[PDB]
Design an enzyme around this catalytic site. Structure first.
Site, PDB file in Angstrom:
ATOM      1  N   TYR A  36       9.636   4.416  -2.304  1.00 37.31           N
ATOM      2  CA  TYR A  36       9.098   5.714  -2.727  1.00 37.31           C
ATOM      3  C   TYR A  36       9.525   6.059  -4.160  1.00 37.31           C
ATOM      4  O   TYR A  36       8.767   6.674  -4.916  1.00 37.31           O
ATOM      5  CB  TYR A  36       9.508   6.835  -1.761  1.00 37.31           C
ATOM      6  CG  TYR A  36       8.910   6.670  -0.390  1.00 37.31           C
ATOM      7  CD1 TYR A  36       7.605   7.083  -0.114  1.00 37.31           C
ATOM      8  CD2 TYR A  36       9.636   6.076   0.637  1.00 37.31           C
ATOM      9  CE1 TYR A  36       7.049   6.909   1.164  1.00 37.31           C
ATOM     10  CE2 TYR A  36       9.078   5.907   1.914  1.00 37.31           C
ATOM     11  CZ  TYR A  36       7.790   6.331   2.164  1.00 37.31           C
ATOM     12  OH  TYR A  36       7.255   6.152   3.440  1.00 37.31           O
ATOM     13  N   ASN A  86      -2.250  10.309   3.567  1.00 39.72           N
ATOM     14  CA  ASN A  86      -3.278   9.335   3.198  1.00 39.72           C
ATOM     15  C   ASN A  86      -4.422   9.319   4.213  1.00 39.72           C
ATOM     16  O   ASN A  86      -4.210   8.977   5.369  1.00 39.72           O
ATOM     17  CB  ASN A  86      -2.671   7.935   3.122  1.00 39.72           C
ATOM     18  CG  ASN A  86      -3.707   6.868   2.849  1.00 39.72           C
ATOM     19  OD1 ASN A  86      -4.790   7.155   2.336  1.00 39.72           O
ATOM     20  ND2 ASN A  86      -3.394   5.634   3.203  1.00 39.72           N
ATOM     21  N   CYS A 107      -0.648   2.758   2.504  1.00 42.79           N
ATOM     22  CA  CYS A 107       0.533   3.592   2.686  1.00 42.79           C
ATOM     23  C   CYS A 107       1.633   2.893   3.487  1.00 42.79           C
ATOM     24  O   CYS A 107       2.800   3.302   3.437  1.00 42.79           O
ATOM     25  CB  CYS A 107       0.160   4.918   3.354  1.00 42.79           C
ATOM     26  SG  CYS A 107      -0.673   4.781   4.942  1.00 42.79           S
ATOM     27  N   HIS A 108       1.268   1.873   4.259  1.00 41.68           N
ATOM     28  CA  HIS A 108       2.271   1.103   4.994  1.00 41.68           C
ATOM     29  C   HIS A 108       3.193   0.244   4.118  1.00 41.68           C
ATOM     30  O   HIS A 108       4.221  -0.227   4.599  1.00 41.68           O
ATOM     31  CB  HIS A 108       1.637   0.223   6.074  1.00 41.68           C
ATOM     32  CG  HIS A 108       0.679  -0.792   5.537  1.00 41.68           C
ATOM     33  ND1 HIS A 108      -0.554  -0.451   5.026  1.00 41.68           N
ATOM     34  CD2 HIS A 108       0.775  -2.139   5.421  1.00 41.68           C
ATOM     35  CE1 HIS A 108      -1.188  -1.544   4.638  1.00 41.68           C
ATOM     36  NE2 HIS A 108      -0.391  -2.582   4.842  1.00 41.68           N
ATOM     37  N   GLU A 126       1.032  -9.157   7.108  1.00 39.07           N
ATOM     38  CA  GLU A 126       0.960  -9.519   5.703  1.00 39.07           C
ATOM     39  C   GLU A 126       2.070 -10.491   5.304  1.00 39.07           C
ATOM     40  O   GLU A 126       1.894 -11.300   4.400  1.00 39.07           O
ATOM     41  CB  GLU A 126       0.980  -8.274   4.819  1.00 39.07           C
ATOM     42  CG  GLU A 126      -0.145  -7.309   5.141  1.00 39.07           C
ATOM     43  CD  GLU A 126      -0.237  -6.155   4.176  1.00 39.07           C
ATOM     44  OE1 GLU A 126       0.542  -6.121   3.203  1.00 39.07           O
ATOM     45  OE2 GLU A 126      -1.094  -5.274   4.399  1.00 39.07           O
TER      46      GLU A 126
END
Length: 165
Positions: A95, A118, A126-127, A153
């Site tokens: 962040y 979001n 946002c993840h 991912e």
């Protein structure tokens, strides 16, 4: 004016909504209160492309989205969401890093709050944002959805086995 379509996914039914071919919303809406959805028209064939790309994403076959987006929120939210879009697949940011990027040093907590609003999940990633202590956040199963996406991912196989021979 807004229509919607829901599809199955490893992280739950994903509702895609918007006007024409432009997405305004993408969320796992089930078991949450979402009063907007009552004003929406079902359209089992809307957002043909986005659904294919989402399916491909979950299957490992997609890494970059090509979808038309219409993001609505405050100036600060837009700046945050724009920066979110610069985070590549398989990477993360903190962040604090995001607050630095948007020109608001020290605003990590504000980014956290804006990230939570979001409207278009996955595609606006946002993840991929996590605090220094490494703990995922999000009520209503949000933590587990995020984790699933992050694990997917990270599991990405090399792009070209020929590069090994």
């Amino acid at each position: 004016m807004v229509h919607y379509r829901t599809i199955d996914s490893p992280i739950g039914p994903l509702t895609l909504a918007g006007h024409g071919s432009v997405l305004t919303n993408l969320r796992m809406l089930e078991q949450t209160y979402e009063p907007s959805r009552t004003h929406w028209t079902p359209d089992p064939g809307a957002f043909s492309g986005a659904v294919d790309q989402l399916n491909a994403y979950f299957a490992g076959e997609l890494t970059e989205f090509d979808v038309e987006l219409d993001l609505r929120g405050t100036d600060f939210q837009q700046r945050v969401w724009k920066a979110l879009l610069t985070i590549p697949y398989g990477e993360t940011r903190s962040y604090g890093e995001i607050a630095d990027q948007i020109g608001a040093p020290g605003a990590a907590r504000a980014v956290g709050l804006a990230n939570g609003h979001n409207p278009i999940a996955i595609i606006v990633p946002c993840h991929r944002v996590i605090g220094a202590s490494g703990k995922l956040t999000g009520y209503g199963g949000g933590i587990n959805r995020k984790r699933a996406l992050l694990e997917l991912e990270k599991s990405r196989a090399p792009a070209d086995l020929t590069l090994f021979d």
